[PDB]
Design an enzyme around this catalytic site. Structure first.
Site, short mmCIF file in Angstrom:
data_model
loop_
_atom_site.label_atom_id
_atom_site.label_comp_id
_atom_site.label_asym_id
_atom_site.label_seq_id
_atom_site.Cartn_x
_atom_site.Cartn_y
_atom_site.Cartn_z
N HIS A 348 0.80 -1.22 0.00
CA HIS A 348 0.00 0.00 0.00
C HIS A 348 0.83 1.28 0.00
O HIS A 348 0.27 2.37 0.07
CB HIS A 348 -0.95 0.02 1.20
CG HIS A 348 -1.95 -1.08 1.20
ND1 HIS A 348 -3.22 -0.93 0.68
CD2 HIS A 348 -1.88 -2.35 1.66
CE1 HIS A 348 -3.89 -2.06 0.82
NE2 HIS A 348 -3.10 -2.94 1.41
N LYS A 539 -7.92 14.21 4.01
CA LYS A 539 -7.07 13.02 4.04
C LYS A 539 -6.09 13.25 5.17
O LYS A 539 -5.96 14.37 5.66
CB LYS A 539 -6.33 12.85 2.71
CG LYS A 539 -5.44 14.04 2.30
CD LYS A 539 -5.47 14.27 0.79
CE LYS A 539 -5.22 12.99 0.03
NZ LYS A 539 -6.21 12.79 -1.06
N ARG A 540 -5.39 12.19 5.58
CA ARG A 540 -4.38 12.34 6.63
C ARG A 540 -3.33 13.38 6.25
O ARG A 540 -3.01 13.54 5.07
CB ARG A 540 -3.72 10.99 6.93
CG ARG A 540 -4.63 10.03 7.66
CD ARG A 540 -4.95 10.53 9.06
NE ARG A 540 -3.76 10.55 9.92
CZ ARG A 540 -3.48 9.62 10.83
NH1 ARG A 540 -4.31 8.59 11.02
NH2 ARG A 540 -2.38 9.72 11.56
N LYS A 545 1.30 14.16 0.55
CA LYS A 545 -0.05 14.53 0.11
C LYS A 545 -0.13 16.02 -0.22
O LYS A 545 -1.11 16.49 -0.80
CB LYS A 545 -1.09 14.14 1.16
CG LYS A 545 -1.32 12.64 1.26
CD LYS A 545 -2.20 12.30 2.46
CE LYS A 545 -2.39 10.80 2.64
NZ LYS A 545 -3.21 10.21 1.53
N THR A 647 -8.13 6.71 -2.30
CA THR A 647 -9.50 6.23 -2.45
C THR A 647 -10.47 7.37 -2.21
O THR A 647 -11.60 7.34 -2.71
CB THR A 647 -9.84 5.06 -1.50
OG1 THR A 647 -9.48 5.42 -0.17
CG2 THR A 647 -9.09 3.78 -1.92
N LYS A 651 -14.22 8.50 -4.06
CA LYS A 651 -15.42 8.96 -3.36
C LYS A 651 -15.93 10.31 -3.89
O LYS A 651 -17.14 10.50 -4.08
CB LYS A 651 -15.18 9.07 -1.85
CG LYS A 651 -14.62 7.81 -1.19
CD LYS A 651 -14.08 8.12 0.20
CE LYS A 651 -13.27 6.95 0.77
NZ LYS A 651 -12.74 7.30 2.12
O1 KOT Z 1 -4.59 0.98 -0.60
C1 KOT Z 1 -5.40 1.74 0.30
C2 KOT Z 1 -4.68 3.05 0.60
O2 KOT Z 1 -3.60 2.75 1.51
C3 KOT Z 1 -3.02 3.98 1.99
N1 KOT Z 1 -2.22 3.65 3.17
C4 KOT Z 1 -1.06 3.00 3.24
C5 KOT Z 1 -0.78 2.95 4.54
C6 KOT Z 1 0.33 2.39 5.15
C7 KOT Z 1 0.74 2.84 6.41
C8 KOT Z 1 1.86 2.28 7.03
C9 KOT Z 1 2.56 1.26 6.39
C10 KOT Z 1 2.16 0.81 5.13
C11 KOT Z 1 1.04 1.37 4.52
N2 KOT Z 1 -1.80 3.54 5.15
N3 KOT Z 1 -2.62 3.93 4.30
C12 KOT Z 1 -2.27 4.62 0.81
O3 KOT Z 1 -1.60 5.79 1.24
C13 KOT Z 1 -3.29 4.98 -0.28
O4 KOT Z 1 -2.62 5.48 -1.43
C14 KOT Z 1 -4.15 3.76 -0.66
O5 KOT Z 1 -5.26 4.23 -1.42
#
Ligand code: KOT
Ligand code: IMP
Length: 807
Positions: A348, A539-540, A545, A647, A651
């Site tokens: 991710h 978003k966070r 970002k 995501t 939305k």
């Molecule tokens: O796939 C679902 C979403 O995942 C988001 N994400 C990734 C993480 C994450 C956080 C820590 C470690 C590894 C991954 N937290 N959120 C990620 O930032 C987004 O780009 C993506 O749409």
């Protein structure tokens, strides 16, 4: 009421009313004379929950009888949000309950607002799991979400003096009507101890035991009578001076106490490792029990799929090996075959600071047997690499699960690739980046493992639930089938020149904006112009970002207004919201900057109602459901190559906002689906970022060449946005000028230019709306039903089904 919300039949309304009163009396032990809105909420929740149980019992019974292949989605996060409306929507109960409660003298909307979000996630990764559960149930898959029941989810964010304050999210305070505790299915989880070698294999001994108690939550499919289970584990001390020994039980129970809120930087904290093993160990015992209750583990992969939501549950790989080798007495090669065929891994993020690299000494103490297994996996894996690429010694060190250095670390991503039959990224560009960059070596060794599964969102929560007005006007033209077959939205393309539909789409948006403008005044006492362009970035808070780039645009707009006050500009309400991880100083500074900009902009008499800057406090699923339907402009402005998918973008697209975005993550596929003419694309592509990195990024160059950007930096440095603390934003300026990994300045000019084009189009309401319709109509690909169908067919080896179970 509205059609999509189902039938309000006299029979059902009557029965809902009486069961409401039954629960108020017998369940809550209250009379109408002392009952509060919260009591009414719970009576409704219990009433709706009653409709789930029959379906829940028979769904799980059906799985026991038909013995399909089972899908286990392992995640440390399930960002569920509220459950009441979602359950009503999926059960076609919404209008009936609305009617029943109306007849009881109650407003159901008000009752829904009482429910706490289940905030058992940080953001996108956690919400993806939640959307996925919904889609798996809707697609009739025998799927189980497995995670941790955190007593405290993501903190509630308070803003004090423009600064983020965190408070514990005590979401279970009033109880959770949705969960069912299953103390009878409590399982032991082992920690520490030591490995003893006998004549017949290794034995893990002298362990400390923590009990894992499951809580089951129903996951209803969309009107198919399927109710799947999300099983969340809670930590419990085993039952075996006196006072202190009892008080020390807290230590064991701390495992499930709190969600780690750090979504930016990997923290090698022991408690986090404990949480990760805890979910893995308890889940795998459940999986194996269920597999046995149908010796021959050859069929294990035919009956079990385990999806690893990133590396967080990566210990599933050596844990499965441990169980198969140490307890079931399978030979290594067979156990490995079974493990690989059972496990699949989803990445991710490519951000290096986020990747899990566990110190060896931590694994050595906590999970000594697992470390031994990881070492053995590594040796055998590296022997494969060496045989495939003879003499390539650097490849061996690059691909090793063990990272050598000051502290030896285990690369969990490397472990996951080695032990999975499938590795996927979450958007086409992200998956390509995986194969070209961080996992290039692994792709070269095993190209067949690497897949793409572009993310999606559930159209149930993210359209029907949060935007019934839009769902309705769509259903009026093309029927209700699109709710579980979102591709049907393409039929809306034939309505792009339909004056009635244009008017309806625009009306729904205006109503949403008015409703949200009212929410802001009522719950936060802030004043906004509902005729303004709703420009939102929720978003966070992360540097990647680029909320900072948005800030730069805001200030640009402000400065331009100040220079030519009597010139017309398209009025904007710039809304930025999101939480910062508690230890992420820069992100906390960014929040302060946003509020500090608002403090200046919002109180400048010359600006008026033309520019408003609002920081949306405590952004979370329930807030997303409110703001997204109200948005005109979706800010998706991460540096190309950094947002794996996003995501939130999807939305917004589904809900009638236009997107200003970089060609990053799923934005690429969104622009592809809608057409680039119907998307506000700007900025460097991944290739341009690469070129700049080769040359070296010099922010000073941009500072020297764009006077508007100079002015902003000078304002920031001199204390224009912080008169009483002139150097408050020194760190931000320093970062921007000297160590900006995310090239904010490099995209500034094109961003501002693109924003001008946004304003231009908004001046033409008919053409704005026509472009909106073209976005909504092409948003079908981004249904998580599509995503899950692809996982099902291409990874899990199971066929989705839209067929109903008998009611
Ligand atoms: O796939 C679902 C979403 O995942 C988001 N994400 C990734 C993480 C994450 C956080 C820590 C470690 C590894 C991954 N937290 N959120 C990620 O930032 C987004 O780009 C993506 O749409
Ligand atoms: O031993 C069994 N006999 C009959 N039904 C069972 C048995 N074990 C599990 N089930 C069914 O499966 C459901 C829960 O099983 P579990 O998911 O393995 O915990 C129950 O509601 C039962 O309907």
């Amino acid at each position: 009421q509205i059609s999509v919300r189902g039938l309000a039949g006299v029979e059902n309304v009557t029965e809902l009313k009486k069961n409401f009163n039954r629960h108020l009396h017998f369940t809550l032990v209250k009379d109408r004379n002392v009952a509060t809105p919260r009591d009414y909420y719970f009576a409704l929740a219990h009433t709706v929950r009653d409709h789930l149980v029959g379906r829940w019992i028979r769904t799980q019974q059906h799985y026991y009888e038909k013995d399909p292949k089972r899908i286990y989605y392992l995640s440390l996060e399930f960002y569920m949000g509220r459950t009441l409306q979602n359950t009503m929507v999926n059960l076609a109960l919404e209008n009936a309950c609305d009617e029943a409660t109306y007849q009881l003298g109650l407003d159901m909307e008000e009752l829904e607002e009482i429910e706490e979000d289940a905030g058992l996630g940080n953001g996108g990764l956690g919400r993806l799991a939640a959307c996925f559960l919904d889609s798996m149930a809707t697609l009739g898959l025998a799927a189980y979400g497995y995670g941790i029941r955190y007593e405290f989810g993501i903190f509630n964010q308070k803003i004090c003096g423009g600064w983020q304050m965190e408070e514990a999210d005590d979401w279970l305070r009033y109880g959770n009507p949705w969960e069912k505790a299953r103390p009878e299915f409590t399982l032991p989880v082992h920690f520490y101890g030591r490995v003893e070698h006998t004549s017949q294999g290794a034995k893990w001994v002298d362990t400390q035991v923590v009990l894992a108690m499951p809580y089951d939550t129903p996951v209803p499919g969309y009107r198919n009578n399927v109710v799947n289970t999300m099983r969340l584990w809670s930590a419990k001390a085993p039952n075996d001076g006196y006072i202190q020994a009892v008080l020390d039980r807290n230590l064991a129970e701390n495992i499930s106490r709190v969600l780690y809120p750090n979504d930016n930087f990997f923290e090698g904290k022991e408690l986090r490792l404990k949480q990760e093993y805890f979910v893995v160990a308890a889940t795998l015992q459940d999986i194996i029990r269920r597999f046995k209750s149908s010796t021959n583990f050859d069929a294990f992969p035919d009956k079990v799929a385990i999806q690893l939501n990133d590396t967080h549950p990566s210990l599933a790989i050596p844990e499965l090996m441990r169980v198969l080798v140490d307890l079931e007495r399978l030979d290594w090669d067979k156990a490995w075959e079974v493990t690989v065929k059972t496990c699949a891994y989803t990445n991710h993020t490519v951000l290096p600071e986020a990747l899990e690299r566990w110190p060896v000494h931590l694994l050595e103490t906590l999970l000594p047997r697992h470390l031994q297994i990881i070492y053995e996996i590594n040796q055998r894996f590296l022997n494969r690499v060496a045989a495939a690429f003879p003499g390539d010694v650097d490849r061996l060190r690059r691909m090793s699960l063990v990272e050598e250095g000051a502290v030896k670390r285990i690369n969990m991503a490397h472990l996951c690739i080695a032990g999975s039959h499938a590795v996927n990224g979450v958007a086409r560009i992200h998956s390509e980046i995986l194969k070209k960059t961080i996992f290039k070596d692994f792709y070269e060794l095993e190209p067949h493992k690497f897949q793409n599964k572009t993310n999606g969102i559930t159209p149930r929560r993210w359209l029907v639930l949060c935007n019934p007005g839009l769902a309705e006007i769509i259903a009026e033209r093309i029927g209700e089938e699109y709710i579980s077959d979102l591709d049907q939205l393409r039929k809306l393309l034939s309505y792009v020149d339909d004056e009635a539909f244009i008017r309806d789409v625009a009306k729904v948006k205006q109503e949403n904006k008015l409703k949200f403008a009212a929410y802001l005044e009522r719950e936060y006492k802030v004043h906004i112009n509902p005729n303004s362009l709703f420009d939102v970035q929720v978003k966070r808070i992360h540097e990647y970002k680029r909320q900072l780039l948005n800030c730069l645009h805001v200030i640009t707009l402000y400065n331009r207004i100040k220079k030519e006050p009597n010139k017309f500009v398209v009025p904007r309400t710039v809304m930025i919201g999101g939480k910062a991880a508690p230890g992420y100083h820069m992100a906390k500074m960014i929040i302060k900057l946003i509020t500090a900009i608002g403090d200046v902009v919002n109180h400048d008499p010359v600006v008026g109602d033309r520019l408003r800057v609002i920081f949306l406090e405590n952004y979370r699923v329930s807030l997303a459901e409110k703001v997204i339907p109200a948005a005109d402009l979706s800010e998706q402005i991460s540096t190309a190559g950094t947002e794996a998918s996003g995501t939130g973008n999807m939305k917004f697209m589904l809900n009638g906002a236009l997107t200003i975005g970089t060609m990053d993550g799923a934005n690429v596929e969104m622009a592809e689906e809608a057409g680039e003419e119907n998307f506000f694309i700007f900025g460097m592509r991944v290739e341009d970022v690469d070129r700049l990195d080769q040359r070296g990024y010099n922010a000073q160059e941009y500072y020297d060449r764009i006077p508007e950007l100079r002015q902003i930096i000078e304002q920031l440095s001199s204390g224009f946005f912080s008169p009483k603390q002139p150097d408050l934003f020194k760190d931000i300026v320093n970062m921007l000028m000297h160590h900006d990994r995310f090239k904010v300045f490099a995209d500034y000019e094109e961003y501002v230019k693109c924003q001008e084009r946004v304003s231009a189009l908004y001046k033409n309401p008919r053409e704005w709306t026509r472009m909106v319709i073209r976005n909504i109509a092409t948003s079908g690909k981004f249904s998580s039903d599509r995503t899950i169908a692809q996982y099902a067919r291409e990874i899990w080896g199971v066929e989705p089904s839209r067929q109903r179970l008998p009611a």
